[PDB]
């Protein structure tokens, strides 16, 4: 009986949501914005080339400095990189070999990691004794494993297939809040400049934006029409952009809760694996099926200067604090520095 | 590198010691099989008794100088791609007794063991073990003829 | 972590001895060893090295080719090997460890010693032989440099060492401006190339020893003569 009640005001709510958000949308982006000057022809090419993975890279993650890097793939390694003069600073073997994700702890001590074995462990960088040990082992998420950051020495974000997201507390070992109310695998996340916020894309092609402290859903957003892969933030704080499998990226401020402009080319049929800006927000980086990273920009809506020089697949991309750089890892085994 | 300081050539020296590491363990893994188990609801168990035996649960048999490593998902049974994301380069399939798995792009080149290549399992047939090493054998013979060109 | 050494005693002019050192507490293998000696009166003067995965050795050019340094891995022990000795030769002899990677901390932990007895490049020079001091109160040190110390990569290659009354040395500042580990942060230490002042607040006791200056940027390693607080 109140079944019906509950979907009729359920279908008022959205209707009522739809109506002020159309009260609002002015104009587009791009009219309102006709002032623009294109910044022209970026051309990039390697600097350095990383050597010694010897299968797919699925993910990577800059130190704080500006300088170190950590990067896993299937082989089941976890290495440690002076980009500066190309040397080997540490290297990690993992317990399983069908990783998704890793970070790096905003302090220098600390790594992470974690994929199909429904665990996220932790490793101690700086011991008395001159080696990388594990410290904890999170245990807990029913499916699988798909991206963490740290927010401090203490503090871990985690996301699953199980359609939840969780907290923890790495010195006892216990989920401190937990995230209900998706319906399909959680595939990404992007934490605030101030750790106070998060943004989470997943399988049912809806997003959500989350607080840590409460706890509780307080904005959504639909828009696109296949299953989320990537999600990156942008540096205001109101920002966050997707790409997804339908062949398409798109942007958006949380304020006005509306959708605003798409990143797009007919030339370009394939899915979106991997997203990230740049410290101005003028370089939008994507990386795609099509062997080749392109290179957006933000405002005027049409360009891809390639990063045309892997021989496969490109599965993550990143750039520095200082802003002087970008790497990417791939499919074919491969890292390398660009500016 | 004769701009080099004292403490930089001891760095070259530990990288270069961390790259022999590796390459030792690439030469020792890069000869190993991986099987990817899969078959209906309760349709699996049987063979997997045969071979003298939350996460993935993965077993391990040694025969014939080939180290084989299997492994099973059958406890996701929905439409199930957010596994296929990791799965694309195995080397075959096995069922146990099918328009997704033999029509899709990834696969687009990757046989599949099949039990009733094609075989019947009865409770004393034990070559059910040389039957999955003569196929594996006979995937890596094509391999090697499409990669040097000869075919 | 322990690093306990012994062979020590007196020989006959001529001669020969061996030395060893025994590690237990650390991953052995990964560290590049030192071997570290001091007169009765004198200051410290550094002795040979060996690297991590025995590629590299060097030799001072007093006894260079009279001397010989080795290593052990799977047992973790050290040797040094000396023939012909001299009557100089008396003093005692120090293991230290290190490591090279981008930012550790070298020379961090020093043995307990050993007793002997018998019967161009950069130079390093301390300002004064001896300082009366008061509690309580700040004091600076200092010593001095012929070349400078600084390099294109942007580091300089000075370190500080403190030596309490009947104890091994102990690491303070390493790289000329870094703090170590365990050390009360009331220290301090900086400079411009060629001078260098290190500096103490709120002088506390246990603070009276000789504190020593060490340049690491061309082998050989050449030490300073001492500046020593009284109380």
């Known amino acids: 009986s109140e079944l019906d009640q509950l979907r009729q005001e359920a279908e008022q709510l959205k209707n009522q949501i739809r109506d002020a958000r159309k009260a609002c949308a002015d104009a587009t982006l791009s009219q309102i914005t006709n002032n623009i000057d294109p910044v022209g022809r970026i051309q990039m090419r390697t600097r350095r080339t990383l050597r010694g993975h010897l299968a797919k890279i699925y993910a990577m993650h800059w130190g704080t400095d500006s300088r170190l890097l950590v990067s896993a793939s299937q082989d089941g390694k976890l290495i440690i990189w002076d980009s500066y003069t190309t040397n080997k600073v540490h290297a990690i073997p993992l317990r399983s070999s069908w990783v998704m994700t890793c970070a790096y702890a905003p302090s220098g001590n600390y790594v992470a990691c974690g994929g199909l074995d429904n665990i996220c462990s932790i490793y101690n960088l700086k011991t008395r004794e001159g080696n990388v040990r594990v410290s904890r082992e999170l245990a807990g998420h029913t499916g699988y494993l798909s991206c963490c950051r740290f927010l401090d020495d203490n503090q871990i974000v985690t996301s699953s297939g199980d359609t939840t997201c969780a907290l923890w507390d790495i010195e006892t070992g216990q989920q401190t809040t937990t995230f209900t109310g998706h319906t399909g695998d959680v595939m990404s996340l992007s934490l605030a400049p101030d750790t106070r916020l998060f943004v989470s894309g997943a399988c049912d092609a809806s997003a959500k934006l989350w607080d840590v402290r409460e706890g509780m859903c307080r904005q959504t957003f639909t828009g696109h029409e296949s299953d989320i892969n990537a999600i990156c933030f942008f540096p205001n704080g109101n920002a966050f952009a997707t790409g997804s499998d339908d062949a398409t990226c798109r942007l958006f401020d949380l304020r006005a809760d509306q959708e605003l402009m798409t990143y797009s080319h007919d030339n370009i049929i394939c899915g979106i694996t991997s997203v990230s800006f740049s410290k101005s927000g003028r370089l939008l980086l994507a990386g795609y099926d099509d062997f080749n990273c392109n290179v957006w920009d933000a405002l005027k809506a049409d360009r891809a200067g390639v990063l045309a020089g892997h021989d496969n697949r490109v599965s993550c991309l990143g750039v520095t604090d200082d802003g002087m750089a970008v790497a990417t890892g791939s499919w074919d085994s491969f890292l390398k520095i660009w500016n | 590198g004769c701009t080099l300081s004292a403490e930089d050539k001891a760095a070259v020296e530990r990288s270069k010691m961390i790259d022999r590491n590796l390459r030792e363990d690439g030469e020792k893994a890069a000869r190993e099989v991986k099987l990817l188990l899969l078959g209906a609801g309760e349709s699996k168990s049987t063979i997997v008794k045969q071979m003298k035996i939350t996460g993935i649960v993965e077993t391990h048999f040694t025969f014939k100088d080939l180290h084989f490593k299997m492994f099973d998902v059958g406890a996701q049974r929905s439409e199930r791609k957010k596994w296929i994301h990791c799965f694309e380069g195995v080397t075959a399939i096995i069922f146990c007794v099918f328009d997704s798995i033999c029509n899709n792009k990834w696969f687009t080149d990757t046989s599949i063991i099949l039990f009733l290549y094609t075989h019947f399992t009865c409770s004393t047939d034990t070559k059910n073990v040389q039957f999955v090493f003569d196929a594996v054998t006979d995937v890596i013979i094509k391999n090697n003829l499409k990669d040097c060109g000869l075919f | 972590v322990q690093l306990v050494e012994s062979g020590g005693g007196l020989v006959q002019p001529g001669g020969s001895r061996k030395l060893s050192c025994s590690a237990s507490?650390?991953?052995?293998?990964?560290?590049?060893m030192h071997w570290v000696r001091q007169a009765p009166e004198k200051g410290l003067e550094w002795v040979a090295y060996?690297?991590?995965?025995?590629?590299?050795?060097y030799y001072a050019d007093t006894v260079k080719g009279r001397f010989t340094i080795s290593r052990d891995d799977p047992k973790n022990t050290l040797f040094l090997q000396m023939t012909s000795l001299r009557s100089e030769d008396t003093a005692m002899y120090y293991c230290?460890?290190?490591?090279?990677?981008?930012?550790?901390?070298?020379?961090?932990?020093w043995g307990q010693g050993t007793t002997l007895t018998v019967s161009s490049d950069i130079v390093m020079t301390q300002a004064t032989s001896s300082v009366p001091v008061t509690p309580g109160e700040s004091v600076s040190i200092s010593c001095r440099s012929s070349?400078?110390?600084?390099?294109?990569?942007?580091?300089?290659?000075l370190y500080w060492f403190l030596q309490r009354p009947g104890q091994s040395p102990q690491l303070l500042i390493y790289?000329?401006?870094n703090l170590a580990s365990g050390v009360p942060d009331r220290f301090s230490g900086s400079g411009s190339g060629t001078a260098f002042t290190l500096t103490i607040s709120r002088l506390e006791a246990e603070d009276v020893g000789v504190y020593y200056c060490?340049?690491?940027?061309?082998?050989?390693?050449?030490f300073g003569a001492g500046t020593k607080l009284e109380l």
């Open positions: 230290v460890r290190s490591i090279y990677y981008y930012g550790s901390s070298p020379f961090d932990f």
């Open positions: 507490g650390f991953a052995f293998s990964s560290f590049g």
């Open positions: 060996i690297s991590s995965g025995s590629g590299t050795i």
């Open positions: 070349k400078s110390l600084l390099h294109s990569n942007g580091n300089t290659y």
């Open positions: 790289r000329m401006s």
């Open positions: 060490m340049q690491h940027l061309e082998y050989p390693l050449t």
